Amino acid sequence: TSQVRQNYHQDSEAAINRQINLELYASYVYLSMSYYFDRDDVALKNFAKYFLHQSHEEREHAEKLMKLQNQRGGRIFLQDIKKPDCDDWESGLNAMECALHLEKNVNQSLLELHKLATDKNDPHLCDFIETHYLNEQVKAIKELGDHVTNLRKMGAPESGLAEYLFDKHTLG
Amino acid sequence: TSQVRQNYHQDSEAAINRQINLELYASYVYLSMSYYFDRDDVALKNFAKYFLHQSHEEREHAEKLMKLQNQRGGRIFLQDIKKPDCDDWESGLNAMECALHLEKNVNQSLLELHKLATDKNDPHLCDFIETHYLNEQVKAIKELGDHVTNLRKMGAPESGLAEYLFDKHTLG
Amino acid sequence: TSQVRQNYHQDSEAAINRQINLELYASYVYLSMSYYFDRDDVALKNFAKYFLHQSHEEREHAEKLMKLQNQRGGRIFLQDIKKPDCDDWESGLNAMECALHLEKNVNQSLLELHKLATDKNDPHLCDFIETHYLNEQVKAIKELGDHVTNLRKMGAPESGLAEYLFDKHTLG
Amino acid sequence: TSQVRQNYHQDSEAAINRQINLELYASYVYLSMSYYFDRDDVALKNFAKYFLHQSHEEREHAEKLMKLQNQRGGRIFLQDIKKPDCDDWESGLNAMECALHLEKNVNQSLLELHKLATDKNDPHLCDFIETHYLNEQVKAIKELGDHVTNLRKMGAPESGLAEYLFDKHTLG
Ligand SMILES: [Ca+2]
Ligand SMILES: [Ca+2]
Ligand SMILES: [Ca+2]
Ligand SMILES: [Ca+2]
Ligand SMILES: [Cl-]
Ligand SMILES: [Cl-]
Ligand SMILES: [Cl-]
Ligand SMILES: [Cl-]
Ligand SMILES: [Cl-]
Ligand SMILES: [Cl-]
Ligand SMILES: [Cl-]
Ligand SMILES: [Cl-]
Ligand SMILES: [Cl-]
Ligand SMILES: [Cl-]
Ligand SMILES: [Cl-]
Ligand SMILES: [Cl-]
Ligand SMILES: [Cl-]
Ligand SMILES: [Cl-]
Ligand SMILES: [Cl-]
Ligand SMILES: [Cl-]
Ligand SMILES: [Cl-]
Ligand SMILES: [Cl-]
Ligand SMILES: [Cl-]
Ligand SMILES: [Cl-]
Ligand SMILES: [Cl-]
Ligand SMILES: [Cl-]
Ligand SMILES: [Cl-]
Ligand SMILES: [Cl-]
Ligand SMILES: [Cl-]
Ligand SMILES: [Cl-]
Ligand SMILES: [Cl-]
Ligand SMILES: [Cl-]
Ligand SMILES: [Cl-]
Ligand SMILES: [Cl-]
Ligand SMILES: [Cl-]
Ligand SMILES: [Cl-]
Ligand SMILES: [Cl-]
Ligand SMILES: [Cl-]
Ligand SMILES: [Cl-]
Ligand SMILES: [Cl-]
Ligand SMILES: [Cl-]
Ligand SMILES: [Cl-]
Ligand SMILES: [Cl-]
Ligand SMILES: [Cl-]
Ligand SMILES: [Cl-]
Ligand SMILES: [Mg+2]
Ligand SMILES: [Mg+2]
Ligand SMILES: [Mg+2]
Ligand SMILES: [Mg+2]
Ligand SMILES: [Mg+2]
Ligand SMILES: [Mg+2]
Ligand SMILES: [Mg+2]
Ligand SMILES: [Mg+2]
Ligand SMILES: [Mg+2]
Ligand SMILES: [Mg+2]
Ligand SMILES: [Pt+2]
Ligand SMILES: [Pt+2]
Ligand SMILES: [Pt+2]
Ligand SMILES: [Pt+2]
Structure with a gap:
């Protein structure tokens, strides 16, 4: 057992590892979207810039969860980062709609995480989720x-x- | 009687209280319009900014009339601020048309106020209305x-x- | 249904609209108190300044709740802003006592709002109330x-x- | 007749000369009050400063009326500046009450002047009185x-x- 671990349920530790994977997946989705708008037959450079910035912010989200895992004495457990659902994104509107769907999925996962942290009476983890996510x-x-x-x-x-x-x- | 009161008719005092209410009402109308354009299904941020600025300017109009009431030795008398006529404003054009109608109504009230101040031979109040309104x-x-x-x-x-x-x- | 709405109960949406009205009412109470101390027969200018500042801060409270309503995909619903209970406030002490009573009433309303958000398992709304109010x-x-x-x-x-x-x- | 005179009634010219005298009288009253508070048996230096400043502002009022008389092609006509009603002012409160009475008397004179300028259809003089006085x-x-x-x-x-x-x- 970790010398720092206190009030940190094994289920919460596992849920944080799943959330790390989902944040890395969202970073990958936004990276794919970004370079779609960099194609010569799409050519919307500020769409490309906007989604690349979003990709970097998702990687920061993932890093903060990895930091949290170690802060609490859990152990990081990584899985494959799945490729995004689409190769081609159709239009700026369709990419924005996909991003909206992605962010609402990530939010559902975070709300399930918060529900678990509440059930395990972990106020530090509840506050971490509310403050940063x-x-x-x-x-x-x-x-x-x-x-x-x-x-x-x-x-x-x-x-x-x-x-x-x-x-x-x-976006400009 | 107020020790400062001089040449200030009771009718003018009452009319100033009515005007205070109308300025506060106009502030509320513009506040409502502003957050209509902040809705996710409207999403025109500079319409929202423009009407919020107009709302704050109407509150300043009301405050200046309250200051005037006290300067002249009248006594402020407040009434309910009615909610605006609409919850939904339809479009940027329709909101601008509503604002035009509102400002012409406020102007009619100010012109009636000036007519009263003229009838009561109150040149300070006439000048206040002409200078600031x-x-x-x-x-x-x-x-x-x-x-x-x-x-x-x-x-x-x-x-x-x-x-x-x-x-x-x-508006940008 | 709003494309952004997620985990936002209809009861919470209604409670936020009631809170918006109460913040606007508190702004109006403080506006009235402020100009009471601006009267020539009261003449306490820093009481007047103090309550005018409080009035502007309550309007900011209301605006932040309207922003929140839209952020969560609820729909703002405005009601009349009732006039304050008194026209005359008696003394600086009595106005301060009235303000204390007002702020404890607003706090009770916020605690009831938080209880509802807890009952509906809405951690974003709980955190919003705790952080800003x-x-x-x-x-x-x-x-x-x-x-x-x-x-x-x-x-x-x-x-x-x-x-x-x-x-x-x-106050000076 | 003055080469500049236009729409300037002889009655208005005379009323402006009377107002010049009244402004000089008010300057003298405030000068007297000021040095009352400079006495060793009164010794309120900021009362003294406040009324000396008021005295200088009344002299500026008089000078502006003399300028106006010449601007309009009237001819200045000076009279004795009467000594103030009191030598001894009793207290800071009594001096403030006397100053209030003086300023309301000066205001009545200005309102009578404005009534005359209105009756003689002199909008420049009306505007001068409203703007500066x-x-x-x-x-x-x-x-x-x-x-x-x-x-x-x-x-x-x-x-x-x-x-x-x-x-x-x-006053400090
Ligand atoms: Ca696969
Ligand atoms: Ca109604
Ligand atoms: Ca009522
Ligand atoms: Ca004499
Ligand atoms: Cl433990
Ligand atoms: Cl533990
Ligand atoms: Cl455990
Ligand atoms: Cl795991
Ligand atoms: Cl996952
Ligand atoms: Cl794997
Ligand atoms: Cl279409
Ligand atoms: Cl956050
Ligand atoms: Cl009078
Ligand atoms: Cl009167
Ligand atoms: Cl009257
Ligand atoms: Cl009234
Ligand atoms: Cl009204
Ligand atoms: Cl003023
Ligand atoms: Cl003033
Ligand atoms: Cl009412
Ligand atoms: Cl058309
Ligand atoms: Cl202009
Ligand atoms: Cl104006
Ligand atoms: Cl213009
Ligand atoms: Cl939902
Ligand atoms: Cl929902
Ligand atoms: Cl619901
Ligand atoms: Cl509602
Ligand atoms: Cl309410
Ligand atoms: Cl925010
Ligand atoms: Cl936002
Ligand atoms: Cl209502
Ligand atoms: Cl006592
Ligand atoms: Cl604190
Ligand atoms: Cl807070
Ligand atoms: Cl404190
Ligand atoms: Cl002291
Ligand atoms: Cl002529
Ligand atoms: Cl002439
Ligand atoms: Cl003549
Ligand atoms: Cl003369
Ligand atoms: Cl005279
Ligand atoms: Cl003489
Ligand atoms: Cl007493
Ligand atoms: Cl003036
Ligand atoms: Mg982002
Ligand atoms: Mg994220
Ligand atoms: Mg405006
Ligand atoms: Mg206005
Ligand atoms: Mg406050
Ligand atoms: Mg508040
Ligand atoms: Mg909590
Ligand atoms: Mg002065
Ligand atoms: Mg003067
Ligand atoms: Mg006029
Ligand atoms: Pt998609
Ligand atoms: Pt309308
Ligand atoms: Pt009260
Ligand atoms: Pt006197």
Whole structure:
């Protein structure tokens, strides 16, 4: 047993390892989306920049969970990072809709994690999730919702002009 | 009787209290409009910013009238601030049209106030209204008229692209 | 249904709308108190400044709740802002006592809101209330208690000298 | 006839000369009050400073009216500046009450002047009075009312401590 471990349930330790994998997966999804918009037949550079930034932020999320695992005396257990569901993302609107779906899935996982930490009476872990993850997810979901709304109202995905101008004015 | 009161008719005092309520009501209308554009299914952030600024300016209008009431030795008398007429505002164009209607109503009230102050031979109150309120209203009405015109000519409310681009270029 | 809504109970949405109204009401109470101390027959300018600042902070509280409602995909629903219970506030001590009563009422409402968010297993909303509201209320109640104590010990409300000197030394 | 004179009634010219005398009289009253508080058996230096500043501001009021008389092509006509009604002012409270009475008398004269300018359809003179005099009088009367209120509530004129502390905190 770790000399630092205190009030840290084995189930919570396992759930944190699963969350680490999911954050790394989200980083990979955003990396894929980013370079889709870097293709010469898509060519929306601020979509590409926006999703690359999101990819780096997910890697930071994963690193913070790994730090937490060690802080609490759990042991990190890594699994394969699955490739994203799509190779081709269709349009800026469809990529934003996929990102919204991804972030709501990550939020569900975090809420299940919080439920477990509550059930195991682990207030440090509850506070860690609330401080570093839950409002970040709410802000990310709201931003992506805003983006989807604007792209739809502007006429995407049929209007390539709409995605071009959104790239310049909102993401630029 | 107030030791400072001089040439200040009871009718003028009452009219100033009514105007205080109307300025607070206009602040509330603009607050409601602002957060309509903050909804995830509307998502026009500079419309939201513009109307929040207008809301704060109406609260300043109300505060200046309360200051005036005390300066002249009248006594402030507050009433409920009614909720705005709408919960949902439809479109950026419709909100601008509502704001134009609101500002012309506030201007009519101020012109009736000035008529009363003229009838009661109160030149200090006439000058207060002319200095701090009447040209402010004329400028606000002209600005909102300009905004309505541009949104109509651009194709709003049917063109969501129009409202998006107006948000960026005129309100941004 | 809102595309962003996740784990946000209809009861919580309604409770947030009620809290928005209560924050706007508290802003109005403090606005009324402020201009009471601006009267020529009261004339305590730092009492007036103190309560005007408190009024603006309550409007910020309300705005943050409106932002939260939209962040979570709820829909804002406004009601009339009732006029405060008093027109005349009697003395600096009595106004401070009224403010203490108001802030403890607002705190009770926030604690009921937190109880509901706990019952609906909404950790994001619990954390929002704890981060932005609960300690703010505890600090405000403690400050107002301190102020009431000092005014009583100095001899208020009978000693107009006491309220004058408190205006200069504590609020100045 | 003056080569510049236009729309300037002989009655208005005479009324402006009377107002010049009244402004010079108010300057003299405040000069007398100032040096009352400089006496070794009164010895309130910030009362003395406050009334000396008021005296200089009244001389500026008079100079501006003399400038106006020449601007409009009227001819200045001076009369004796009467000595103030009192040699001894009793107390800081009594001097403030006298100043309040003086400023309300000056305001009545200005309102009669404005009534005359209105009757003679002289909008330049109306605007001059409203811009440079009427709100200045309202602010001065409100300030003096505030001061009287505070001195009374603190226990003046019986409390020499009250006048001492008002001298330091409000006028200092
Ligand atoms: Ca596979
Ligand atoms: Ca109603
Ligand atoms: Ca009522
Ligand atoms: Ca004589
Ligand atoms: Cl343990
Ligand atoms: Cl343990
Ligand atoms: Cl365990
Ligand atoms: Cl594991
Ligand atoms: Cl996983
Ligand atoms: Cl694996
Ligand atoms: Cl967070
Ligand atoms: Cl947000
Ligand atoms: Cl936030
Ligand atoms: Cl469409
Ligand atoms: Cl009168
Ligand atoms: Cl009157
Ligand atoms: Cl009357
Ligand atoms: Cl009234
Ligand atoms: Cl009204
Ligand atoms: Cl009412
Ligand atoms: Cl104006
Ligand atoms: Cl203009
Ligand atoms: Cl202008
Ligand atoms: Cl059209
Ligand atoms: Cl859900
Ligand atoms: Cl939900
Ligand atoms: Cl529900
Ligand atoms: Cl509701
Ligand atoms: Cl409520
Ligand atoms: Cl209602
Ligand atoms: Cl807090
Ligand atoms: Cl504290
Ligand atoms: Cl604290
Ligand atoms: Cl007592
Ligand atoms: Cl002291
Ligand atoms: Cl002429
Ligand atoms: Cl002439
Ligand atoms: Cl003539
Ligand atoms: Cl003459
Ligand atoms: Cl005279
Ligand atoms: Cl003479
Ligand atoms: Cl003025
Ligand atoms: Cl004032
Ligand atoms: Cl003013
Ligand atoms: Cl007394
Ligand atoms: Mg992110
Ligand atoms: Mg993440
Ligand atoms: Mg405005
Ligand atoms: Mg206004
Ligand atoms: Mg506060
Ligand atoms: Mg509050
Ligand atoms: Mg908790
Ligand atoms: Mg002066
Ligand atoms: Mg003068
Ligand atoms: Mg006029
Ligand atoms: Pt997808
Ligand atoms: Pt409307
Ligand atoms: Pt009360
Ligand atoms: Pt006198």
